[PDB]
């Protein structure tokens, strides 16, 4: 980027007397655009800024698209017979002053004149009068009491509480086992009394299919579950596309049907260097025919002759009689849709029992009597914590209110009951005798 304007010849004589030129600039760096706004005005003052109001018009919007974090101004010094010395010392500088101010996101109420020139503005956070003016959308307010805004005490700390569990449960066995089961006889595994490690599992082995419903994969390390389940099978590539709730498919897909509202996700990866035999591998078996559909999360091990035709087969395997179970044909040399994939399903459930499986958050100290953030096994919010007098039976975890909101909880570590009472909050009222008479106001917190 380079730009040269038309040539000119500015005056270079050092003027005496008082300052007479004021030059205001606004520099912004937004979305790769360097925006410059400029304004020039004749003045007469020895220091400080004039009190008059003035607007700034856009000049250039240069599209560079780079960082700008530090900046420095350049000054032109004077050399003559009155400044003896070398280049480092033989110099003088004429009188010149400059002011630097920093912007920040604010809301302004601007007034446009008939010609569209901004002649006045109000900063909505300077003082109660300005905020009231912004609320009413006017530069003058009559007398009375006005409801302007609200307030709330900001939190001062954050606390995290997790159960005292140290042993890391092995996800390996359901992932690096020498052999798994068939599609129809899909296996199940329970996981409990664990500290979860979904972090490294996401990207360690360069998985193929990883996609989750009802929970974000990056947020899996922030939630506490109970009795994490695991499924397992190996199946063709194409059916992997319909291993998902609310989706139909073949009878093998009806063997393992997911519920409409399923929390968790499926993890699939490639398998050709262990499930491919030079002579062909046919150990794995799948279903091909059934009477009707199956309920979600249901297993079948029944093996009976399929009897769709109007003839009683009675185990003859004759014409119009088919064995419902068929064996997959897997060879190292086949189509791209013919290599088996190993699939494991993780399912989750919430708010049923004390938490037992969740990730490694270092539990922090407990601070009470001051309303702060908290995290009680995934129960977040804000509020003052204090001792409670309500007696919990040994099997009870927490209590709730009419508004279906938590107001009492049990500390997972020391098994202590605590109350929850959010910070004090309210509206704000401004009492003013009107801008016409005076600019004094009173503030009332209700």
């Amino acid at each position: 980027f380079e730009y040269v304007s038309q040539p000119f010849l500015m005056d270079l004589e050092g003027k005496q007397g008082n300052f007479k030129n004021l030059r205001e600039f606004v520099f912004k760096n937004i979305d790769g655009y360097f925006k410059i706004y400029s304004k020039h005005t004749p003045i007469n003052l020895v220091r400080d800024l004039p009190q008059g109001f003035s607007a700034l018009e856009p000049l250039v919007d240069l599209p560079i698209g780079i960082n700008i974090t530090r900046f420095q101004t350049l000054l032109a010094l004077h050399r003559s017979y009155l400044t003896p010395g070398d280049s480092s010392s033989g110099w003088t500088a004429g009188a010149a002053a400059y002011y630097v101010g920093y912007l920040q996101p604010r809301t302004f109420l601007l007034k446009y004149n008939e010609n569209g020139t901004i002649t006045d503005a109000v900063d909505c956070a300077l003082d109660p009068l300005s905020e009231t003016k912004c609320t009413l959308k006017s530069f003058t307010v009559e007398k009375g009491i006005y409801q302007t805004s609200n307030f709330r005490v900001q939190p001062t700390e954050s606390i995290v509480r997790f159960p005292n569990i140290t042993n890391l449960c092995p996800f390996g066995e359901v992932f690096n086992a020498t052999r798994f089961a068939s599609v129809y006889a899909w296996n199940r595994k329970r996981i409990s009394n664990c500290v979860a490690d979904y972090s490294v599992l996401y990207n360690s082995a360069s998985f193929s299919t990883f996609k989750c419903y009802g929970v974000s994969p990056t947020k899996l390390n922030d939630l506490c579950f109970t009795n994490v389940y695991a499924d397992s099978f190996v199946i063709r590539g194409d059916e992997v596309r319909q291993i998902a709730p609310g989706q139909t498919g073949k009878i093998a897909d009806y063997n393992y049907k997911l519920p409409d509202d399923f929390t968790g996700c499926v993890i699939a990866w490639n398998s050709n260097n262990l499930d491919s035999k030079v002579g062909g591998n046919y150990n794995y078996l799948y279903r091909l025919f059934r009477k009707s559909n199956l309920k979600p999360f249901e297993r079948d091990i029944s093996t009976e002759i399929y009897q769709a035709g109007s003839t009683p087969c009675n185990g003859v395997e004759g014409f119009n009689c088919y064995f419902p179970l068929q064996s997959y044909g897997f060879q190292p040399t086949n189509g791209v849709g013919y290599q088996p994939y190993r699939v494991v399903v993780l399912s989750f459930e919430l708010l049923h029992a004390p938490a037992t499986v969740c990730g490694p958050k270092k539990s922090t100290n407990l601070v009470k009597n001051k309303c702060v953030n908290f995290n009680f096994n995934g129960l977040t919010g804000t509020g003052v914590l204090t001792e409670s007098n309500k007696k919990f039976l040994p099997f009870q975890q927490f209590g709730r209110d009419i508004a279906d909101t938590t107001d009492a909880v049990r500390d997972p570590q020391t098994l202590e009951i605590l109350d929850i009472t959010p910070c004090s909050f309210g509206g704000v009222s401004v009492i003013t005798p009107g801008t016409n008479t005076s600019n004094q106001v009173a503030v009332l917190y209700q």
């Binding site: 009802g214 929970v215 974000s216 990056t218 947020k219 922030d222 939630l223 509202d261 995934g378 977040t380 919010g381 009419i402 508004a403 279906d404 909101t405």
Partner: protein, 50 residues
């Protein structure tokens, strides 16, 4: 009492607690659920005002 009770409703979303939705869902999938909750509560407030 009815206005306060109206906060304990799904309105079609996965959960009726806004912090729960924010805790376990990324913004692109959380926006639609939050919108459903917002429109339900907006109707519940307009009825009371009327």
């Amino acid at each position: 009492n009815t206005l306060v009770k109206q906060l304990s409703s799904n309105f079609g979303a996965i959960s009726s607690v806004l912090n729960d939705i924010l805790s376990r869902l990324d913004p692109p999938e959380a926006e639609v659920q939050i919108d459903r909750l917002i429109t339900g509560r907006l109707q519940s407030l307009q009825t009371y005002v009327t």
